Amino acid sequence: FVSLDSPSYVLYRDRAEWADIDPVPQNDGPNPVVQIIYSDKFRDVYDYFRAVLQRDERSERAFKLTRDAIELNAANYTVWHFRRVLLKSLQKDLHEEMNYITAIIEEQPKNYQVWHHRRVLVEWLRDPSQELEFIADILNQDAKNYHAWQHRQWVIQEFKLWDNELQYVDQLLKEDVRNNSVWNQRYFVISNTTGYNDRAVLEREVQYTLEMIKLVPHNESAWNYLKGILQDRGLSKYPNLLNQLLDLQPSHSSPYLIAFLVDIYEDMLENQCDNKEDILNKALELCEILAKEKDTIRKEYWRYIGRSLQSKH
Amino acid sequence: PVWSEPLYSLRPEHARERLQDDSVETVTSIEQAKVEEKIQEVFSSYKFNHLVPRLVLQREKHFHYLKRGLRQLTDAYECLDASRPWLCYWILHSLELLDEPIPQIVATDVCQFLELCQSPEGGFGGGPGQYPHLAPTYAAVNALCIIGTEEAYDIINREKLLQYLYSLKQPDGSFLMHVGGEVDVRSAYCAASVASLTNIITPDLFEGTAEWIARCQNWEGGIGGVPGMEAHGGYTFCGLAALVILKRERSLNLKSLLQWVTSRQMRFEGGFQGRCNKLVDGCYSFWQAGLLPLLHRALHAQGDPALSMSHWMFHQQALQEYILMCCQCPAGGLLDKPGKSRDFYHTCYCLSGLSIAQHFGSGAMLHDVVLGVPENALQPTHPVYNIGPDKVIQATTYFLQKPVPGF
Ligand SMILES: CC[C@@]1(c2cccc(Oc3cc([C@](C)(N)c4cncn4C)ccc3C#N)c2)CCCCN(C)C1=O
Ligand SMILES: CC(C)=CCC/C(C)=C/CC/C(C)=C/COP(=O)(O)OP(=O)(O)O
Numbered sequence: 001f002v003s004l005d006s007p008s009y010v011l012y013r014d015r016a017e018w019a020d021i022d023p024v025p026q027n028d029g030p031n032p033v034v035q036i037i038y039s040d041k042f043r044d045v046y047d048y049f050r051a052v053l054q055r056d057e058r059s060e061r062a063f064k065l066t067r068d069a070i071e072l073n074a075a076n077y078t079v080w081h082f083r084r085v086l087l088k089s090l091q092k093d094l095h096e097e098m099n100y101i102t103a104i105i106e107e108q109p110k111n112y113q114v115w116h117h118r119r120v121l122v123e124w125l126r127d128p129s130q131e132l133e134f135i136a137d138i139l140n141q142d143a144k145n146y147h148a149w150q151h152r153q154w155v156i157q158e159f160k161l162w163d164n165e166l167q168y169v170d171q172l173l174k175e176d177v178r179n180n181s182v183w184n185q186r187y188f189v190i191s192n193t194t195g196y197n198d199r200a201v202l203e204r205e206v207q208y209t210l211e212m213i214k215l216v217p218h219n220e221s222a223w224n225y226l227k228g229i230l231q232d233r234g235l236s237k238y239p240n241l242l243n244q245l246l247d248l249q250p251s252h253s254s255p256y257l258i259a260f261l262v263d264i265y266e267d268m269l270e271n272q273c274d275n276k277e278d279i280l281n282k283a284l285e286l287c288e289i290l291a292k293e294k295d296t297i298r299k300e301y302w303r304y305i306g307r308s309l310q311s312k313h
Numbered sequence: 314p315v316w317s318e319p320l321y322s323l324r325p326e327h328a329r330e331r332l333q334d335d336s337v338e339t340v341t342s343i344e345q346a347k348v349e350e351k352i353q354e355v356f357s358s359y360k361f362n363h364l365v366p367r368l369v370l371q372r373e374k375h376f377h378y379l380k381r382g383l384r385q386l387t388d389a390y391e392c393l394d395a396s397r398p399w400l401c402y403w404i405l406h407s408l409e410l411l412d413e414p415i416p417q418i419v420a421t422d423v424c425q426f427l428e429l430c431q432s433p434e435g436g437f438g439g440g441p442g443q444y445p446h447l448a449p450t451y452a453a454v455n456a457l458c459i460i461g462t463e464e465a466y467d468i469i470n471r472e473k474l475l476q477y478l479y480s481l482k483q484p485d486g487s488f489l490m491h492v493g494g495e496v497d498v499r500s501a502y503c504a505a506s507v508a509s510l511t512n513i514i515t516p517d518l519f520e521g522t523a524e525w526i527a528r529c530q531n532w533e534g535g536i537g538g539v540p541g542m543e544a545h546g547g548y549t550f551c552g553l554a555a556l557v558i559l560k561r562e563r564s565l566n567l568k569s570l571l572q573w574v575t576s577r578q579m580r581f582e583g584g585f586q587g588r589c590n591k592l593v594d595g596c597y598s599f600w601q602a603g604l605l606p607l608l609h610r611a612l613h614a615q616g617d618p619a620l621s622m623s624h625w626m627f628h629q630q631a632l633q634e635y636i637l638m639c640c641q642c643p644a645g646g647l648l649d650k651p652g653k654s655r656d657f658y659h660t661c662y663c664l665s666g667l668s669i670a671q672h673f674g675s676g677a678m679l680h681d682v683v684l685g686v687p688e689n690a691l692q693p694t695h696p697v698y699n700i701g702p703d704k705v706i707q708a709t710t711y712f713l714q715k716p717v718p719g720f
């Protein structure tokens with residue numbers, strides 16, 4: 001009806017349709033702490049919200065009131081909870097509420113309550129038809145919004161909408177190959193569809209990642225993804241990878257490449273590799289190089305790795 | 314000389330740690346470069362050729378900022394009207410870290426206020442009359458323990474608190490943040506924290522929880538809000554801290570987690586980022602760096618012969634340099650990064666992180682590294698609960714003398 005910023009907005013204490021119920025002030029005690037000096041409009045709405053809640057009034061007026069309470073503080077989980085109780089009691093049109101939550105999330109995308117509310121609605125309706133496109137719009141404004149990605153994974157998994165996600169992942173990686181949220185989604189999609197056991201799929205992924213690394217040598221996400229899809233089986237189980245990385249050593253070098261080499265050597269030593277002493281010496285030299293020159297911020301970590309290698313092999 | 318102290322961030326070789334975008338620009342590298350340019354300017358303002366004055370934590374300014382916020386706040390804090398116990402906790406913990414005494418009158422007033430926030434169904438809400446929620450419940454319990462008086466301890470309705478936790482427990486081991494709310498790793502931490510402090514843990518309360526948390530660790534090594542999601546410092550701290558409380562750290566791949574968190578420290582800024590390829594932020598001084606003392610204890614329990622006996626596995630000096638030079642508001646209070654405004658949340662976590670960076674402790678070994686003037690030394694903080702270690706022992710001892718509600 002009327003928004004909190006509308007020129008014709010009227011305080012609830014002045015509304016005739018609300019005259020029959022007494023507002024309930026918030027009791028902060030005689031000697032308040034962390035006392036917020038609320039604006040008159042804020043307190044007005046919450047004094048009446050407290051009244052309807054305490055009275056557990058499942059009414060249309062109470063429903064409209066929650067909308068104002070939310071605008072004043074969208075992080076108030078108690079209001080959202082009551083609004084959901086009202087949606088059910090009043091048998092409100094859920095598609096209408098979806099249009100409402102859509103606008104709200106667009107305005108405040110970094111809020112836990114709005115995304116949870118939307119999930120509840122999709123669950124109640126068992127209708128995910130608007131989700132992927134809506135999420136895509138949010139991500140178009142902030143490609144790393146954590147809540148957006150979490151909601152996207154839930155929808156895809158709950159309603160089995162895997163068909164076009166890898167294509168979506170590739171598009172976002174084209175836009176920003178450094179978007180770690182997208183590499184995470186990539187793993188999410190593959191691990192839940194084909195899996196990484198299919199050697200053809202793994203080869204495709206290792207090739208894809210290596211190409212991205214050659215394109216942007218200092219992008220940590222690609223390096224982390226490479227290790228991520230190979231670590232469970234063991235980095236030493238892929239002999240050709242060591243050589244290829246060793247070839248890029250002189251040129252496409254970086255702390256990421258050197259660190260990856262140490263990780264390979266660690267696994268090799270842990271798997272009774274041949275020429276153990278030689279491998280250990282190479283690993284230790286690299287740990288020193290990393291600690292003293294190429295990755296000094298992680299000096300303590302690399303020194304620890306050097307000592308660990310010596311205690312184990 | 315005692316009046317000059319060389320800094321890691323000011324070394325000439327440090328310029329080599331600047332971002333290398335490989336001549337391929339994307340929104341990510343552009344934002345990272347912008348932050349780095351600003352940070353370099355700040356770093357340079359603390360160097361006068363070979364003269365490098367000791368860094369100073371503006372204790373008194375922070376103290377006055379905190380003292381004021383504990384009583385009143387402008388309507389600018391309306392957005393936190395559902396998190397008032399958090400304001401109490403952030404402020405009380407900051408004062409505690411600064412070794413600033415809390416007047417008896419203030420302590421009693423906080424106790425009374427938190428009592429008003431406590432729900433008859435158990436737990437605490439974000440304000441008087443609000444529904445209980447694990448986030449403010451965690452904050453309220455911590456605040457009460459920081460005060461540490463029997464008056465504070467007794468405010469907690471332990472019988473209802475345990476019932477409330479039960480009312481949020483899911484069959485897969487996870488917990489809801491509140492009735493009809495959402496689930497993510499933060500809930501497990503909030504629940505484990507308050508349950509262990511108040512001695513209300515039952516054998517089945519956290520049945521399955523450790524396994525659920527482990528499912529949240531992902532390919533990166535860190536932990537996401539829920540299984541499948543991107544690793545983030547906030548959720549990773551909650552996950553490991555919860556497992557430490559449950560003594561189930563081994564449920565995780567501690568190796569991949571260690572490599573992940575250490576990688577989150579920014580080679581140039583010195584501070585920590587929340588997730589790979591995002592920006593440095595002062596609050597991660599606690600959420601991320603706080604994972605190292607936890608990992609240290611976990612590995613130590615396993616008998617790791619390679620663990621250090623004097624340092625955490627991150628650059629303690631660089632973190633202190635980032636916090637002291639880039640996260641202090643001239644008017645008092647701390648923040649995310651230069652250009653951002655101060656707030657009590659960042660004041661609490663920047664200080665908590667600074668304390669962790671200054672103090673190493675393992676077994677009978679203690680080794681301090683207080684950068685700058687000696688007065689910068691803060692009181693220690695417990696890596697699991699993030700309240701003074703003395704407060705943890707005192708609370709646990711007190712509550713251990715009471716039985717678990719209804720056994
Ligand atoms: C600040 C108030 C509070 C909180 C408390 C303690 C720790 C918090 O960590 C967060 C901080 C941020 C915040 C303020 N955007 C931020 C500041 N610096 C980094 N980040 C990510 C966002 C989300 C979370 C979470 N959970 C967040 C209350 C409890 C309910 C959770 N949310 C939404 C919050 O806003
Ligand atoms: C006990 C408790 C409540 C712990 C929570 C700790 C914590 C800091 C959680 C962060 C959660 C989150 C959604 C971050 C993304 O925000 P962002 O995108 O603004 O930040 P980013 O760019 O640094 O990732």
Ligand SMILES: OC[C@H]1O[C@@](CO)(O[C@H]2O[C@H](CO)[C@@H](O)[C@H](O)[C@H]2O)[C@@H](O)[C@@H]1O
Pocket residue numbers: 191228229231232527528529530531532533534535564565566569570
């Ligand atoms: O850091 C990897 C490490 O995490 C575990 C859980 O503790 O599994 C995660 O990572 C795997 C990829 O490496 C995913 O398949 C799995 O779903 C995710 O939970 C460990 O098994 C692994 O060693």
Ligand SMILES: [Zn+2]
Pocket residue numbers: 594595596597649659
């Ligand atoms: Zn922050």
